[PDB]
Design a protein around this ligand. Structure first.
Ligand code: 152
Length: 591
């Protein structure tokens, strides 16, 4: 007894996408590049040309697959991408800081966290998750079955994702890591009932007392390295039988819990952003970065000072399902405990040891060095925008997300004097196995709006009109992307279809304009959550920013990242300008 299957991801018409492409280039390429590109696009879609053939191939593909894009996207965005997953790929989440002030409180909370994960897991194992809906239509729930009991596995050419969640006898253990030492924690009794919060606590105390030592090699930091380096250190590491079993238990574990040491000083105004770094990368090879296995799809982190969150491996996951999980887990942690499984003898959780050799020690040192370089190059800021949230744009009958996106467009322009390639993530969950597509926030509408906004010679009435029209156009683009009518994945599909067809890369993809279009100086996503949390990730280009936010009713949590390698970007500076742009838009509309 079930409802019908979801629609399949559509292949958009070629002309509809190339026109949208040409529309989207206008604000970010020169007059001369635009005209060249239009000629290129004309040769491309020409009757009897390269583009028509590639489009028939996609149409073919969609007929033969459940989702024409899914393998391609997994592979090109993640598994064949060989930069470290840390910062460049795995997004982190920072929770409100918890109350606890002593180890009991810390391990109690971790205990409840684990209980909540296992409760959510019931619906996962059973496939009884309440289906999520959008606009009265159901959304694909497939991503929720790719989060637990899974792990990325390094490979020589590309990586893979192992999922043990539906094996004949699925894992019943989690892994816990503390002072770089990993432990296998069984979280179900022989009868298949979960341990209780109290039983989890007792076991965590054993794990804590078994890992007090701080001079153990941080093997886990190897997972933070370039994927080709890590693929090599990985094979070295698991030559040893014990080492292999330890990795194995980590990879198979339902999820990982990191019991973090507290960070250094921090200015007291640089804190929120230091904790964000802690969640994203660990803070450094001397800090918690080796208290981690970055291949693990789900890592929860509980620090000594109350600082909490997670970091997730992105390859098969997206933000919203991860924060649904998180929202559930946190709200579980505040529910009354009801039924206390009877006292029983509890075994000693197994410490998962590593035999280190001079070689493994050398990989570790090299990994510490690489990570230090990455962390040192990362500029991240967290801004809480307190003046308003969804409430204000809602009162103006404007989409709050489109409003925020236009504010960011305005900020960028006030700093840089021009528009830039901007990505906003769109969820394609209305379709079977759908992941994401690209909303392009820089448009002639936004450009006209931002150029006019500070022009003393334009009337306020004119400015308001252009504002409402930029915001509303962005909402239109947003809704089209979510219905499968955007073009970026379609263009990527055309390119990959070319490789399939044994032809060279089409000229439109080697053009001037396409690199500029694909070079996102602003890489963004809205990730709404019931919990007052924020998500963050690194920029996708050396000279760009990563922007992620959680709009609540009366405030908005923002994170912004940049690389220090590029003196012209400054996360905190963009954050200030973004605060001012939101303020200036509300003021303009209310005058
Ligand atoms: C972080 N960012 C926007 C680069 C990627 C999103 O998390 C996922 C996506 O849009 O595919």
């Amino acid at each position: 007894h079930h409802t019908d299957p979801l629609p399949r991801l559509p292949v958009p018409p070629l002309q509809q996408s190339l026109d949208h492409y040409l529309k989207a280039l206008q604000p970010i390429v020169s007059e001369e590049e635009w005209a060249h590109t239009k000629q290129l696009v004309d040769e491309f879609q020409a009757s009897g040309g390269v583009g028509e053939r590639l489009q028939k191939g996609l149409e073919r593909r969609a007929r033969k697959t459940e989702n024409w894009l899914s393998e391609w996207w997994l592979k090109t965005a993640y598994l064949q991408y060989r930069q470290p997953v840390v910062i460049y790929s795995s997004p982190g989440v920072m929770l409100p800081k918890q109350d606890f002030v002593d180890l009991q409180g810390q391990l109690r909370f971790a205990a409840k966290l684990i209980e909540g994960v296992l409760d959510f897991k019931v619906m996962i194992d059973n496939e009884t998750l309440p289906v999520e809906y959008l606009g009265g239509k159901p959304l694909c729930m497939n991503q929720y079955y790719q989060i637990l009991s899974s792990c990325r596995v390094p490979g020589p050419k590309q990586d893979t994702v192992s999922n043990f969640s539906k094996t004949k006898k699925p894992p019943t253990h989690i892994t816990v890591v503390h002072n770089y030492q990993f432990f296998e924690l069984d979280v179900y009794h022989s009868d298949g009932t979960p341990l209780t919060a109290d039983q989890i606590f007792v076991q965590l105390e054993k794990i804590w007392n078994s890992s007090l030592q701080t001079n153990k090699e941080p093997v886990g930091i190897l997972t933070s390295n370039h994927r080709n380096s890590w693929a090599k250190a990985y094979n070295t590491l698991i030559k040893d039988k014990v080492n292999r079993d330890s990795v194995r238990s980590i990879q198979k574990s339902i999820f990982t819990v990191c019991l973090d040491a507290t960070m250094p000083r921090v200015s007291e105004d640089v804190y929120r952003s230091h904790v964000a770094g802690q969640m994203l990368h660990g803070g450094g090879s001397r800090l918690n970065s080796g208290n981690r296995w970055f291949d693990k799809t789900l890592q929860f982190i509980v620090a000594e000072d109350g600082s909490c969150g997670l970091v997730y491996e992105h390859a098969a996951a997206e933000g919203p399902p991860i924060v649904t999980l998180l929202d559930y887990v946190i709200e579980y942690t505040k529910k009354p405990e009801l039924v206390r499984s009877p006292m029983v003898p509890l075994p000693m959780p197994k410490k998962l040891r590593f035999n280190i050799t001079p070689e493994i020690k050398s990989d570790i040192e090299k990994a510490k060095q690489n990570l230090s370089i990455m962390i040192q190059d990362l500029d991240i800021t967290v801004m809480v925008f307190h003046h308003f949230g969804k409430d204000f744009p809602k009162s103006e009958k404007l989409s709050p997300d489109a409003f925020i996106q236009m504010a960011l467009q305005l900020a960028y322009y006030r700093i840089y004097g021009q528009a830039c390639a901007t990505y906003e993530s769109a969820s394609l969950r209305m379709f079977h196995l759908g992941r994401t597509d690209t909303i392009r926030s820089a448009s002639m509408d936004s450009l006209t709006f931002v150029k006019a906004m500070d022009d003393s010679s334009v009337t306020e009435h004119q400015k308001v009109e252009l504002l409402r029209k930029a915001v509303q156009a962005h909402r239109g683009y947003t809704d089209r992307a979510i219905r499968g009518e955007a073009f970026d994945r379609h263009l990527l599909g055309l390119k990959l279809q070319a490789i399939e067809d044994l032809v060279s890369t089409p000229d439109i993809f080697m053009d001037t304009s396409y690199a500029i279009a694909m070079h996102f100086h602003l890489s963004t996503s809205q990730v709404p959550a019931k919990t007052d949390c924020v998500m963050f990730f690194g920029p996708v280009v050396p000279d760009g920013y990563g922007v992620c936010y959680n709009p609540m009713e009366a405030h908005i949590n923002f994170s912004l990242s940049a690389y220090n390698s590029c003196a012209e970007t400054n996360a905190a500076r963009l954050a200030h300008y973004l605060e001012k742009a939101l303020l200036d838009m509300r003021a303009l509309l209310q005058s």
